[PDB]
Amino acid sequence: XLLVXAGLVLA
Amino acid sequence: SGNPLVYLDVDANGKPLGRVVLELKADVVPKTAENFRALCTGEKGFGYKGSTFHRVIPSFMCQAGDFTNHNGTGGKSIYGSRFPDENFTLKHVGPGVLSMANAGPNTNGSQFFICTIKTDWLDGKHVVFGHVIEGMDVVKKIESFGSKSGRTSKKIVITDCGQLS
């Protein structure tokens, strides 16, 4: 999807 | 008191994309603003200079600030490995919003993103702390080298950065 993460990059 | 302005001078292959100028809302989130400010000046001996926009998703955002692992997995703050979410007062109201990337609650480090759309599903999860005031066209140039996966086509480097005011 549209998230902004640092390590577990998600959909 | 005051809301700092900072700049990011962005290049690729030693060829300039331009300057992005950001206001930091220290009036609302001074701790978060201070971290970013100091990472721009480099006053603690580490910071954004030389690091990349590593994850760039057209129609969404440009993400940067991993100056430890250089891929999204790292970064650190001027307060330690991580710091808590200061507040969620500011919202992801539209293009140009500057907000912290994280790995869930209370995991702010150095990574950040610049929105190219409104991203209000991040409200209450990502601390908003400023916005672009000049150089949205630069941001659009960055975006042109991204992809749905977020992989960029070339190394988009923050060659210099600092505080304007």
| Residues B111 and B100: beta-carbon distance below 8 Å | yes
Distance (Å, whole) CA B139 – CA B156: 11
Chain A, nearest residue to B98 by Cα: A4
Is B106 catalytic? The answer is no
- Domain spanning B1-165: CATH superfamily: Cyclophilin-like (2.40.100.10)
- Dump the DSSP string for B106-124: T-B-S-EEEESS--GGGTT
Distance (Å, whole) CA B135 – CA B162: 15
Phi, psi of B155 (to 5 degrees): -75, 115
Q: What sign has the CA pseudo-torsion B66, B70, B71, B74?
A: negative
Which of B37, B54, B122, B145 is the catalytic position? B122
Q: Which residues of chain B have a CB within 8 Å of the CB of A11?
A: none
Q: Please report, to the nearest 10 degrees, the dihedral formed by the alpha carbons of residues B7, B137, B60, B77 taken in order.
A: -10
> Domain extents for chain B?
1-165
Distance (Å, whole) CA B87 – CA B11: 33
Contacts (Cβ under 8 Å, ≥6 apart) of B43: none
Is B113 catalytic? The answer is yes
Q: Which residues of chain B have a CB within 8 Å of the CB of A10?
A: none
| Residues B146 and B118: beta-carbon distance below 8 Å | no
| Residues B64 and B48: beta-carbon distance below 8 Å | yes
The two counts, helices (H) then strands (E), for chain A are 0, 0
| Resolution of the model in angstroms | 1.2
Smallest CA–CA separation between B148 and chain A, in Å? 10
CB environment B72-108: b (16+ within 10 A), e (fewer)? bbbbbbbeeebbebbeeebebeebbbbbbbbbeeebb
Distance (Å, whole) CA A1 – CA A11: 4
- What residues in chain A have their Cβ under 8 A from chain B's Cβ atoms? 2-9
Distance (Å, whole) CA B89 – CA B11: 33
- Dump the DSSP string for B37-77: HHHHHTTTS-SSTT-BEEEEETTTEEEE--TTTSSSS---B
